[PDB]
Amino acid sequence: TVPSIVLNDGNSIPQLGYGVFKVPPADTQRAVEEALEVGYRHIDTAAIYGNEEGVGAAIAASGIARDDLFITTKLWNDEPAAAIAESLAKLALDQVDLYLVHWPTPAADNYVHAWEKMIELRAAGLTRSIGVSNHLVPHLERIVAATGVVPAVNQIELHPAYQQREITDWAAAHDVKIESWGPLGQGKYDLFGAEPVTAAAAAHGKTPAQAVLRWHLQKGFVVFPKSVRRERLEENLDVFDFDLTDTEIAAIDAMDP
Ligand SMILES: [Cl-]
Ligand SMILES: [Cl-]
Ligand SMILES: [Mg+2]
Ligand SMILES: [Mg+2]
């Protein structure tokens, strides 16, 4: 099953979650109920852009203890507070488990302020944990030095061809968990056809997608494979029954230059 990762604030998070994806608002409830039945307990609603009413309905009708669920969401575009408050209403929840704000600005003149706001959100109990996205080592050092609060999570683009090692190393050194955004390259390159990928799939009797997912997992990363078809939901979840060897992992790691 899905292992629970330790967050720096005392909370634990299921390593693999369901990313609500490609679902019109009316079918959202049904989709989440399906993920719940499959076995997912970690839900990420980012991709639905605030169309969370259906998510709330599913949770409410699920029968699952609040404490057994992990609700994640992110602010896309002074407004995290307004944003989260609205989401809470839609979700019919007192708080979410994890809240993340957007990539720092090219102007880099507000990410600190943004972090201060997140800290207040947390203090206000709107979210149990606070994290960031696309924060580089310098961004991270800056917010920590400025606020004294270390993010629980840092969401960054991550896949074999692009690993952002500086970030992951730093994170590991400071107890920050990494969430792999676009874990499978987003179909931008031939990931499934890569020798290191096919080789692992073949050896373990898994699919290439599965092998890659496993790679992230063994590396200690948090992932939200964006599933649509039940078949995929299933496969995406069934990646805890095998282990890539150290050699298998290194071959994949070598995919980046
Ligand atoms: Cl709640
Ligand atoms: Cl992807
Ligand atoms: Mg340090
Ligand atoms: Mg070993």
UniProtKB/Swiss-Prot annotation:
Q: Where does NADP(+) bind?
A: 182-236
Q: How is it used?
A: Introduced by genetic manipulation and expressed in Erwinia herbicola by Anderson et al. The resultant organism is able to convert in a single fermentative step D-glucose into 2-keto-L-gulonic acid, a key precursor in the industrial production of L-ascorbic acid (vitamin C). However, the technology still needs some working on and is not used in commercial production at present.
Q: Which PROSITE patterns match?
A: ALDOKETO_REDUCTASE_1
Tagged with keyword Oxidoreductase: yes
User: In which broad location class does this protein mainly occur, judging by the first location in its UniProt entry?
Assistant: cytoplasm
Among SUPFAM superfamilies, the record links this protein to: NAD(P)-linked oxidoreductase (SSF51430)
Outcome of altering F21Y?
Answer: Tighter binding of NADH
The protein's Enzyme Commission number: 1.1.1.346
Which of UniProt's keywords are assigned here?
Ascorbate biosynthesis, Cytoplasm, NADP, Oxidoreductase
Biological process (GO) annotations held by this record are:
L-ascorbic acid biosynthetic process
Q: Which GO terms describe its cellular component?
A: cytoplasm
Compartments reported by the entry: Cytoplasm
CDD domains linked:
AKR_AKR5C1 (cd19130)
Q: Where does substrate bind?
A: H102
Q: How does it assemble?
A: Monomer.
What is the protein's known function?
Catalyzes the reduction of 2,5-diketo-D-gluconic acid (25DKG) to 2-keto-L-gulonic acid (2KLG). 5-keto-D-fructose and dihydroxyacetone can also serve as substrates. 25DKGR-A exhibits a greater selectivity for the substrate and higher thermal stability than 25DKGR-B.
Family of this protein: Belongs to the aldo/keto reductase family.
Per its record, how is this protein called by name?
2,5-diketo-D-gluconic acid reductase A
- List the source organism: Corynebacterium sp. (strain ATCC 31090)
